Structures are given as structure tokens and as C-alpha cells.
Design an enzyme around this catalytic site. Structure first.
Site, mmCIF file in Angstrom:
data_model
loop_
_atom_site.group_PDB
_atom_site.id
_atom_site.type_symbol
_atom_site.label_atom_id
_atom_site.label_comp_id
_atom_site.label_asym_id
_atom_site.label_seq_id
_atom_site.Cartn_x
_atom_site.Cartn_y
_atom_site.Cartn_z
ATOM 1 N N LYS A 344 -39.692 -4.376 1.348
ATOM 2 C CA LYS A 344 -40.554 -4.606 0.195
ATOM 3 C C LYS A 344 -40.893 -6.073 -0.025
ATOM 4 O O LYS A 344 -41.992 -6.377 -0.501
ATOM 5 C CB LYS A 344 -39.894 -4.053 -1.073
ATOM 6 C CG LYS A 344 -38.614 -4.770 -1.467
ATOM 7 C CD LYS A 344 -37.803 -3.949 -2.457
ATOM 8 C CE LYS A 344 -36.976 -2.878 -1.760
ATOM 9 N NZ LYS A 344 -35.951 -3.456 -0.848
ATOM 10 N N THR A 345 -39.983 -6.990 0.310
ATOM 11 C CA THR A 345 -40.262 -8.411 0.126
ATOM 12 C C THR A 345 -41.444 -8.862 0.976
ATOM 13 O O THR A 345 -42.282 -9.650 0.522
ATOM 14 C CB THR A 345 -39.020 -9.236 0.464
ATOM 15 O OG1 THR A 345 -37.931 -8.835 -0.377
ATOM 16 C CG2 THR A 345 -39.288 -10.720 0.265
ATOM 17 N N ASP A 398 -37.781 -12.587 -6.432
ATOM 18 C CA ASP A 398 -37.221 -11.816 -5.332
ATOM 19 C C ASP A 398 -35.806 -11.373 -5.676
ATOM 20 O O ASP A 398 -34.989 -12.180 -6.132
ATOM 21 C CB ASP A 398 -37.214 -12.641 -4.042
ATOM 22 C CG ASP A 398 -37.463 -11.799 -2.804
ATOM 23 O OD1 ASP A 398 -37.602 -10.564 -2.932
ATOM 24 O OD2 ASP A 398 -37.519 -12.375 -1.697
ATOM 25 N N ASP A 399 -35.526 -10.089 -5.455
ATOM 26 C CA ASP A 399 -34.184 -9.527 -5.605
ATOM 27 C C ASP A 399 -33.655 -9.752 -7.024
ATOM 28 O O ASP A 399 -32.674 -10.461 -7.253
ATOM 29 C CB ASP A 399 -33.235 -10.115 -4.552
ATOM 30 C CG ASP A 399 -32.724 -9.075 -3.567
ATOM 31 O OD1 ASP A 399 -33.069 -7.882 -3.702
ATOM 32 O OD2 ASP A 399 -31.971 -9.456 -2.647
ATOM 33 N N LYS A 426 -43.272 -12.499 -21.432
ATOM 34 C CA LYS A 426 -44.268 -12.232 -22.458
ATOM 35 C C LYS A 426 -44.940 -13.495 -22.981
ATOM 36 O O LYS A 426 -45.864 -13.391 -23.794
ATOM 37 C CB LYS A 426 -43.638 -11.473 -23.635
ATOM 38 C CG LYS A 426 -43.441 -9.986 -23.374
ATOM 39 C CD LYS A 426 -42.286 -9.401 -24.180
ATOM 40 C CE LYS A 426 -42.282 -9.885 -25.624
ATOM 41 N NZ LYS A 426 -41.287 -9.148 -26.450
ATOM 42 N N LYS A 503 -36.650 -1.789 8.998
ATOM 43 C CA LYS A 503 -35.682 -2.814 9.382
ATOM 44 C C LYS A 503 -34.494 -2.196 10.112
ATOM 45 O O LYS A 503 -34.042 -2.712 11.148
ATOM 46 C CB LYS A 503 -35.217 -3.578 8.143
ATOM 47 C CG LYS A 503 -34.400 -4.822 8.444
ATOM 48 C CD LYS A 503 -33.755 -5.370 7.184
ATOM 49 C CE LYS A 503 -33.238 -6.783 7.390
ATOM 50 N NZ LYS A 503 -32.394 -7.239 6.252
HETATM 51 N N1 LIG Z 1 -45.107 -2.997 8.340
HETATM 52 C C1 LIG Z 1 -44.004 -3.577 7.857
HETATM 53 N N2 LIG Z 1 -43.675 -3.356 6.565
HETATM 54 C C2 LIG Z 1 -42.574 -3.933 6.076
HETATM 55 N N3 LIG Z 1 -41.703 -4.733 6.694
HETATM 56 C C3 LIG Z 1 -42.052 -4.933 7.968
HETATM 57 C C4 LIG Z 1 -43.158 -4.408 8.617
HETATM 58 N N4 LIG Z 1 -43.201 -4.831 9.936
HETATM 59 C C5 LIG Z 1 -42.137 -5.589 10.053
HETATM 60 N N5 LIG Z 1 -41.398 -5.696 8.905
HETATM 61 C C6 LIG Z 1 -40.169 -6.460 8.718
HETATM 62 O O1 LIG Z 1 -39.466 -5.834 7.679
HETATM 63 C C7 LIG Z 1 -38.565 -6.818 7.154
HETATM 64 C C8 LIG Z 1 -38.181 -6.352 5.776
HETATM 65 O O2 LIG Z 1 -37.902 -7.500 4.949
HETATM 66 P P1 LIG Z 1 -36.437 -7.819 4.456
HETATM 67 O O3 LIG Z 1 -35.593 -8.328 5.556
HETATM 68 O O4 LIG Z 1 -36.531 -8.730 3.232
HETATM 69 O O5 LIG Z 1 -35.935 -6.405 3.938
HETATM 70 P P2 LIG Z 1 -36.083 -5.536 2.614
HETATM 71 O O6 LIG Z 1 -35.671 -4.106 2.958
HETATM 72 O O7 LIG Z 1 -37.420 -5.689 2.007
HETATM 73 O O8 LIG Z 1 -34.942 -6.150 1.694
HETATM 74 P P3 LIG Z 1 -33.599 -5.703 0.956
HETATM 75 O O9 LIG Z 1 -32.514 -5.819 2.029
HETATM 76 O O10 LIG Z 1 -33.370 -6.781 -0.107
HETATM 77 O O11 LIG Z 1 -33.744 -4.330 0.394
HETATM 78 C C9 LIG Z 1 -39.436 -8.066 7.075
HETATM 79 O O12 LIG Z 1 -38.600 -9.135 7.497
HETATM 80 C C10 LIG Z 1 -40.461 -7.873 8.207
HETATM 81 O O13 LIG Z 1 -40.024 -8.722 9.259
#
Ligand SMILES: Nc1ncnc2c1ncn2[C@@H]1O[C@H](COP(=O)(O)OP(=O)(O)OP(=O)(O)O)[C@@H](O)[C@H]1O
Ligand SMILES: Nc1ncnc2c1ncn2[C@@H]1O[C@H](COP(=O)(O)OP(=O)(O)OP(=O)(O)O)[C@@H](O)[C@H]1O
Ligand SMILES: Nc1ncnc2c1ncn2[C@@H]1O[C@H](COP(=O)(O)OP(=O)(O)OP(=O)(O)O)[C@@H](O)[C@H]1O
Lengths: 535, 41, 83
Positions: A344-345, A398-399, A426, A503
């Protein structure tokens, strides 16, 4: 004798992007000293004897001060550079201060209404003009000096041939009594230039150098002005200087020794390539954006493995358009939520980048390891305050869950940060500006129970992989398993459902790839099966 | 928590130059004048 | 003809024991300028009021004077800080 110099001209001043401020300062300070004294006496008024300035670093304060000091055909202005009037012997500091005004007093008592004009510059006025304690036990280090200055500026005797100017970066610490309309009346703020201001600044810092044919025809000044967004004044000069230095360095050499060419140094030229190079890696703007953070958050890029990614991006674009071209709602916030490891980030960062706003800042807990709650509150306050100095902005939190310091046991968390964030979600920005805030989280029910969903205006959902077809499409897009193994893996996954985040899929692929060439598929299948679903 | 600076106590005027032997010399001349004036009578 | 001044500062940072002081000393001694004025850490702090500011101002006095009395043909000066 006219107050202004006979040959003074505005164009020679060398100032750009501060026309209105200069006009107002002139109107309020010098307009009364231009027509004959008869009308001024008839109106029965007294000339102003104070000015003040403030703003962020690098906006052209000292330049304006020096120019205004030079603009008068009178004695040479005095100077005081911060605490340069302090002394160790009792009472000498006050005598030093008093010595400054002696000449003006003598002139006034001697020559009366035709007296001359004097100037002073209390540069870094904040150093020795802190607010008085006004309480026993809190004796100030500099209090007698402040009292003497207040008495002398306006006391039992009157003067009408003086003018004071001040400059500082903290307009909220100056003593309260020293800001009433009788002592320091005209105060102005110096802010970041606009497009036309940047164009003017670049033009003034280039006119001279064009005199001797030192510019090729490839330099499109308008393009350079439009490209650089929200640059302070000093950084334009820094960029130009760095470009000139790098252009000149090519003709010179050295290494083992030092030498210079004499048959090529007469054909010196500066082209757009050196400008670009330096713009890229030379001057790092302070109120802008740079690709390093995006490269750190988008490390593996974005891949379109289905429909939801397009819908999410379209919704982000719609929200950005709404905030940008609306006036009744100058504050809109959106909260991103989804299961863990759903990625999501990255979507938030991509939306922020594609928004195309002048200013973007990412407040993340990575920089706040081990801090206390007070430090975190201060950092958030500073960031949000900084975001109030631009016609367009965008901030990404973030987070959140890790920011509140949440832990299911108890549960426990920090109340102060939650209160600060609630109040800070607000607060409308200063009238005539816009703002946009994007958040993230991985536990919606917790926030919904803490009474936080009534502060956010909308909500979006980011799902996981739901069917084997999307998993196969993602695998093919990544390009790790070839068609031969693709058929075998598909023959298995096609007849069931999967539940995994991208991921985790990447990590599983990496772990599987370490085995033998013909044992990868089996271990990959085993790991996928062991992962489970856990709806 | 660092004891802040303190104002120089004050000035204790005290001046001494070259008087001792300069005025002793001054004296030795007057004494001789007195002796001569006494002798004349 | 270009109408540009000269950069006024350089900052070097790194982990302990990597060759910063050697580079600083070599660059200082390379130029034909006079001996570099050195400040051994915080040796300008004092107890009496208004001594630190005077000590700080004293460093720039000679260079300032020389600039005033020559102009564009003045010599070069260096100041080396430690910690
Ligand atoms: N299409 C995509 N959509 C989302 N993320 C993608 C995509 N393609 C590759 N990624 C990778 O997914 C990773 C997800 O980001 P991150 O490591 O912050 O995980 P997160 O699941 O969003 O975070 P958290 O662990 O806090 O829940 C990004 O680093 C990006 O490299
Ligand atoms: N509008 C402008 N046009 C040209 N130069 C400008 C302008 N505004 C600022 N400058 C540049 O400002 C430089 C001097 O620094 P300046 O006095 O602006 O810093 P400052 O804002 O006083 O910093 P501080 O916060 O320390 O007081 C000069 O090199 C001058 O060219
Ligand atoms: N590049 C280098 N080549 C050879 N010797 C080097 C080099 N860099 C450092 N040294 C050695 O460093 C020794 C002194 O290092 P010094 O402590 O002055 O450096 P530093 O890393 O800047 O120090 P500090 O840790 O105090 O900041 C010299 O004897 C020199 O031999």
C-alpha cells in the site's frame, strides 16, 4: 538638498520579485520626505522611525537592507552585527548604545528643522532583544540594554531625524513592547518568489555576462525558469555559479601539474549541457522534491497485474483534481487500508509523485527511532508548519499504527500523539491555499473503534491476489519461470484459489530460486501450499 | 546548567610611577642650598 | 567579465580515522597564502561577559583590514576549524 541621490535608478538596484514590498516600504517610510516641508508641517504629522523584516533563509533580506541604506544621499550608515555591543565592565553596554544616538541628538539640538538624516542597522535584532521575564527569579541576561534602547528610541525627549531597521528569522520572540506603532510600525515578510520572480532573478544575474558573448543560442531562459519550481533566491545564483565553474573547468586541467591552454581559452562558451548536469547534481532544493525518496520507496517499481491498480490510480487522480481545482473544500484527506503485505505504501508514493505538485514531503517513522513522544510531536508540527508556505502541497503519513505506538497487550499507546494528529487533521490552512493528506494503515477496526474515522473524508480498499489467473499473469510479467514450467505450475494452481500479497510472492520466488535447476518448482509449490489462506 | 558569566567586580584605582628617588634627589639639592645660605651670614 | 564571487566554505565528514586532517593540512599548505589560523576545538569560550564574541571577531580582523586597504588585489586567507 534632495534626500535621494541625484542619479539613483531602480533598474540599477538589482532586485527582482519584491516590487510590491519595496513600493509599500517606500510609501510608508519616505513619501513624507519628498514634498516641501510647508505641507508636511501643515498636516502636523511625524515621520516614521522604524522598519522590520522577516522570512525563511535565503530570500533577500540583507540585500534589501543594504540597498535601502545606500539609497539615501546622507551620512554613511552605521552597523551592528549581532552582539557587538556587549561588554564585561558594569554599565559599558548602555554607554555603548547611548554613544550611537549622540550625533543625532547633537544635530537636532543644533540645527533644528533642517537637520540631517541618520540610519542604523540592528542586524540580528533577536540576539539582544529577547522578551523580558517579568517575574522574580527569572532575571534576564540582557534586560538593562533593552530598557535603555526602549527609553532612547522614544523617551522623555523627541527626535525626528532617525530611522531603524531590523531583520530576524523568529518574529514571535521580539519583545512585545518594541512592536507598537510608535517605535516599529512598518514590518514586512519576505517569501519565496514566483515564476515571474524567478525569471527576473535569472535575467538580472545574467545580463552582465551576456555583454561579452558568453552565451550560446541553446539557452532557453523561459524553459529554465519554468523547470525550476519553488527555488529560493540564493539557489538560482548558486546554480548559475556552479554552471559557470563547470563550463570553465573543461579548458583548464592539472592532475600531476597545473597548466592552462592559451590557444583555446579565447573561444570560451557555456551551453545547456553543463546547466543540466549541475541542476541534476549540484544544488539540492530545500522546499522541493528529489528522486532519492521515490527510488527508495518504489525500489521494484509498479506492475499492472489486474484491474484494481488502475481503479486506485484513477481515484487518486480524481481526488488530486478535486483538491487542485476547488475552493469550498481546501482540505481533503484519504485513508488507505488493507491487509498486511498488500503493498500500500508504494501506491501512495506513486500517487504523490504523479500528482505533480510543487511541494511533497513524506513523514515516516524511519527517521524517529527511539524518540520520545515530545520529539515526535515537534517533528510533526514542524513538517505541517512547513507545508503551509506553498500554494499547493501534499503530505503522506506512513504506518499510522506504528506511529501511535500501539501494542495489543493492555492495549497501550501514546495519547498525546493521537490528540495532536486529531487536532492537526482539521486545521484549515491559511486563507487562500490548498492542502492534501494521504494516510496508510493495516488495521482498520482499531482506528474505527478509537473514533478516528470521523476525521477522514473517504476510504479506499486495496485487495490481494484472488485467483490463479492473476498469479500466473504476475509470474509471467516478472519473467522468472519459463513456459515449460509455467504449464506445470498452472496445471496445479488453476484448479483452486490463492491468497498472497505481492511482496510475499517476491520473497517466496527469491527463496525458491536458490535450489537446484530442476528442484525449484517442487519447493515453490510446497512453500505455496504451506503458506495457507487464513481468510 | 553552566554558571553564567559574571560582571567584572569593579575598578580599584591605584597608580604608582617614579616618585621615590626623584623626590629624594629633589631634596638633596634643597639641603645644600640651605647649608650655603647659612654659611654666607 | 563574468562577475562572480568565490565559494566561501567546505565541509568534510566521515567516520573516525579516514584521512580528513591530512587532506585539510595539505590543502592549506598548498596555497601561497599565509599560515592558517587554527582553533583547537572550543578554546574561545570564557567566563567574563562578551569575551567569546570579541575572540571570534579577532580572527577576521586582519583579512578584513587587508581587503579594505588593497581591494581586488588583496592576498588570500584561510581559517581552519577543529570539531
Ligand atoms: N504493482 C505493485 N503494487 C504494489 N507494490 C508493488 C507492485 N510491484 C511491486 N511492488 C513492491 O511492493 C512493495 C510493497 O511495499 P512495502 O515494502 O512498503 O510493503 P507494504 O505491504 O505496503 O507494507 P507493510 O509491511 O507496512 O504492510 C513495494 O516496495 C514495491 O517494491
Ligand atoms: N531577489 C534577489 N535577486 C538577487 N539576488 C538575491 C535576491 N534575493 C536574495 N538574493 C541573494 O541573496 C544573497 C545574500 O544572502 P541573503 O542576504 O539573501 O541571505 P539571508 O536571507 O539574509 O539569510 P539569513 O537567514 O542568514 O539572514 C546574495 O547573493 C543575493 O544575490
Ligand atoms: N589516504 C591516506 N593515505 C595515507 N595515510 C593516510 C590516509 N588517510 C589517513 N592517513 C593516515 O592518517 C594518519 C592520521 O590520521 P588522522 O587522525 O589525522 O585522520 P582523520 O581520520 O581525519 O582523524 P579524526 O579521526 O581525528 O577525525 C596519518 O598518519 C596518515 O598516515
Amino acid at each position: 538638498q534632495s534626500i535621494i541621490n541625484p542619479d539613483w535608478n531602480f533598474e540599477k538596484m538589482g532586485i527582482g520579485g519584491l516590487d510590491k514590498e519595496f513600493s509599500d516600504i517606500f510609501r510608508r517610510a519616505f513619501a513624507s520626505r519628498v514634498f516641501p516641508p510647508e505641507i508636511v508641517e501643515q498636516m502636523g504629522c511625524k515621520h516614521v522611525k522604524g522598519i522590520l523584516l522577516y522570512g525563511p533563509p535565503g530570500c533577500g533580506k540583507t540585500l534589501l537592507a543594504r540597498q535601502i541604506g545606500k539609497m539615501l544621499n546622507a551620512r554613511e550608515p552605521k552597523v551592528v552585527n549581532g552582539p557587538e555591543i556587549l561588554n564585561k565592565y558594569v554599565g559599558e553596554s548602555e554607554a555603548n548604545i547611548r554613544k550611537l544616538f549622540a550625533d543625532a541628538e547633537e544635530e537636532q539640538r543644533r540645527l533644528g528643522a533642517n537637520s540631517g538624516l541618520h540610519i542604523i542597522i540592528f542586524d540580528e535584532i533577536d540576539a539582544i532583544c529577547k522578551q523580558r521575564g517579568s517575574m522574580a527569579g527569572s532575571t534576564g541576561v540582557h534586560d538593562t540594554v533593552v530598557n535603555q534602547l526602549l527609553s532612547k528610541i522614544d523617551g522623555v525627549e523627541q527626535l525626528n531625524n532617525i530611522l531603524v531597521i531590523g531583520m530576524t528569522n523568529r518574529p514571535d520572540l521580539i519583545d512585545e513592547a518594541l512592536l507598537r506603532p510608535g517605535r516599529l510600525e512598518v514590518k514586512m515578510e519576505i517569501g519565496l518568489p514566483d515564476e515571474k520572480g524567478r525569471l527576473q532573478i535569472l535575467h538580472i544575474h545574467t545580463a552582465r555576462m551576456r555583454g561579452h558573448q558568453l552565451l550560446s543560442a541553446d539557452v532557453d531562459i523561459k524553459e529554465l525558469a519554468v523547470e525550476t519550481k519553488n527555488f529560493s533566491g540564493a539557489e538560482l545564483e548558486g546554480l548559475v555559479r556552479a554552471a559557470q565553474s563547470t563550463a570553465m573547468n573543461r579548458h583548464i586541467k592539472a592532475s600531476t601539474k597545473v597548466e592552462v591552454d592559451m590557444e583555446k581559452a579565447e573561444s570560451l562558451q557555456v551551453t545547456r549541457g553543463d546547466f543540466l548536469a549541475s541542476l541534476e547534481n549540484d544544488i539540492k532544493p530545500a522546499f522541493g522534491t528529489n528522486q532519492e525518496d521515490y527510488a527508495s520507496y518504489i525500489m521494484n517499481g509498479i506492475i499492472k497485474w489486474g484491474d484494481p491498480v488502475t481503479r486506485v490510480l484513477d481515484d487518486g487522480e480524481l481526488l488530486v483534481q478535486q483538491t487542485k481545482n476547488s475552493d469550498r473544500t481546501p482540505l481533503v484527506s484519504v485513508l488507505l487500508e488493507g491487509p498486511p503485505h498488500s503493498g500500500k505504501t508504494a501506491l501512495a508514493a506513486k500517487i504523490a509523485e504523479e500528482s505533480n505538485f510543487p511541494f511533497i514531503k513524506i513523514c515516516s517513522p524511519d527517521k524517529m527511532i527511539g524518540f520520545s513522544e515530545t520529539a515526535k510531536c515537534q517533528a510533526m508540527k514542524k513538517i505541517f508548519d512547513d507545508a503551509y508556505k506553498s500554494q499547493l502541497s501534499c503530505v503522506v503519513v506512513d504506518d499510522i499504527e506504528r506511529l501511535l505506538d500501539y501494542v495489543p497487550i493492555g492495549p497501550r499507546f501514546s495519547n498525546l500523539v493521537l490528540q495532536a494528529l486529531l487536532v492537526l487533521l482539521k486545521k484549515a490552512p491559511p486563507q487562500g491555499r490548498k492542502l492534501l493528506i494521504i494516510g496508510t494503515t493495516s488495521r482498520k477496526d482499531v482506528l474505527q473503534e478509537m473514533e478516528m474515522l470521523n476525521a477522514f473524508s473517504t476510504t479506499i480498499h486495496v485487495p490481494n491476489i484472488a485467483t490463479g489467473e492473476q498469479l500466473l499473469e504476475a509470474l509471467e510479467l516478472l519473467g522468472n519461470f519459463k513456459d515449460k514450467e509455467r504449464t506445470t505450475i498452472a496445471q496445479q494452481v488453476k484448479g483452486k484459489k490463492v491468497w498472497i500479497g505481492i511482496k510475499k510472492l517476491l520473497m517466496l520466488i527469491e527463496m525458491s530460486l536458490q535450489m537446484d535447476p530442476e528442484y525449484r518448482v517442487r519447493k515453490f509449490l510446497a512453500l505455496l501450499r504451506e503458506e495457507g489462506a487464513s481468510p | 546548567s553552566m554558571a553564567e558569566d559574571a560582571d567584572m567586580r569593579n575598578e580599584l584605582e591605584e597608580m604608582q610611577r617614579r616618585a621615590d628617588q626623584l623626590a629624594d634627589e629633589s631634596l638633596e639639592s634643597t639641603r645644600r642650598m640651605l647649608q650655603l645660605v647659612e654659611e654666607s651670614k
